[PDB]
Design an enzyme around this catalytic site. Structure first.
Site, short mmCIF file in Angstrom:
data_model
loop_
_atom_site.label_atom_id
_atom_site.label_comp_id
_atom_site.label_asym_id
_atom_site.label_seq_id
_atom_site.Cartn_x
_atom_site.Cartn_y
_atom_site.Cartn_z
N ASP A 148 0.86 -1.18 0.00
CA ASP A 148 0.00 0.00 0.00
C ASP A 148 0.90 1.23 0.00
O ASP A 148 0.67 2.24 0.71
CB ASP A 148 -0.94 -0.02 1.21
CG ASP A 148 -2.12 0.94 1.07
OD1 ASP A 148 -2.26 1.56 -0.01
OD2 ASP A 148 -2.90 1.09 2.03
N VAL A 149 1.92 1.15 -0.83
CA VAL A 149 2.86 2.23 -0.97
C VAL A 149 2.26 3.38 -1.75
O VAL A 149 1.86 3.20 -2.89
CB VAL A 149 4.12 1.76 -1.68
CG1 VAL A 149 5.13 2.94 -1.83
CG2 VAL A 149 4.75 0.61 -0.89
#
Length: 264
Positions: free
Chosen positions: A165-166
């Site tokens: 979930d960068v």
């Protein structure tokens, strides 16, 4: 699912407290907690929230250093793609390389999802099929996907522990835009590391993606010759994610978005 509270210790230490809003926090956070525990055990070149207080009453951790990258009156703005500090891509490359090198067996012992490379590929195939059964997919888009899926030279031959979930908002940076930590680890799992490169492609274009790949490769991260092309096809598979969110949310706006993005 939770209220967030900033505060300070008696000893002057900044803290984050998560107040649960739902009676099922524990089994719903177990994976994240395990992932965070893992990452804190092995990482030394970046921080991750360390949940040293973990109960149904309360989840609390010492506040990370730095500020989230990008936007927060209107004082602090999104990253300026015309003027990205080089330290940003270099340091994100260092961080992803360390993270992606954390021992997979240690993850396998926990409740994290762990894909071999073959399972990551199969996972993508099935998600595409599921989405298509629900919404259909335009012919050209579907053909592009299938061409990617079936192309052995594109697919990585190693998987690793990813953040999953960068985004700019999940990246903690110092004054020089050196990445010092990452937050929001709910998608952590062992899989195709390419997911963690999508942000750079989408926010900074081909140039930013290349900068990140270069740093990652140079500091010793797993590299293969078609990595950049693969990341770009993976990006082209985003409508899978939109359709998936429409399905789970039942929110009409996103059903509409999914259908538009799936080119039906």
């Amino acid at each position: 699912d939770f209220q967030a509270v900033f505060a300070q210790d008696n000893n002057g230490i900044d803290w984050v407290l998560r107040l649960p809003r739902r009676e099922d926090v524990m089994p719903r956070t177990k994976v994240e907690k395990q992932a965070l525990d893992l990452v804190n055990k092995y990482a030394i070149s970046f921080q991750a929230p360390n949940w040293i207080i973990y109960t149904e009453e309360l989840i609390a951790y010492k506040k990370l250093d730095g500020v989230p990258a990008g936007t927060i009156g209107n004082y602090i703005w999104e990253i300026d793609i015309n003027n990205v500090p080089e330290l940003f891509h270099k340091s994100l490359g260092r961080v992803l390389a360390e993270l992606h090198s954390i021992p997979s067996n240690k993850a396998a012992a926990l409740d994290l999802v762990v894909h071999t490379p073959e399972e990551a590929r199969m996972s993508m195939k099935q998600r595409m099929d599921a989405v298509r059964a629900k919404f259909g997919v335009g012919e050209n888009l579907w053909n592009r996907w299938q061409a990617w899926l079936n192309d052995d030279d594109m697919w990585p031959k190693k998987t690793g522990l990813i953040h999953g979930d960068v985004h700019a908002g999940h990246t903690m940076i110092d004054k020089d835009a050196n990445v010092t930590g990452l937050i929001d680890w709910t998608e952590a799992k062992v899989t195709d590391v390419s997911h963690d490169f999508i942000f750079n492609y989408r926010a900074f274009g081909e140039e930013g993606l290349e900068a990140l790949i270069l740093a990652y490769k140079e500091i010793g991260g797993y590299y293969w010759p078609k990595m950049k092309e693969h990341i770009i096809e993976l990006n082209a598979a985003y409508p899978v994610s939109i359709a998936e969110f429409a399905l789970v949310s039942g929110i009409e706006e996103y059903e509409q978005m999914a259908k538009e993005a799936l080119e039906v």
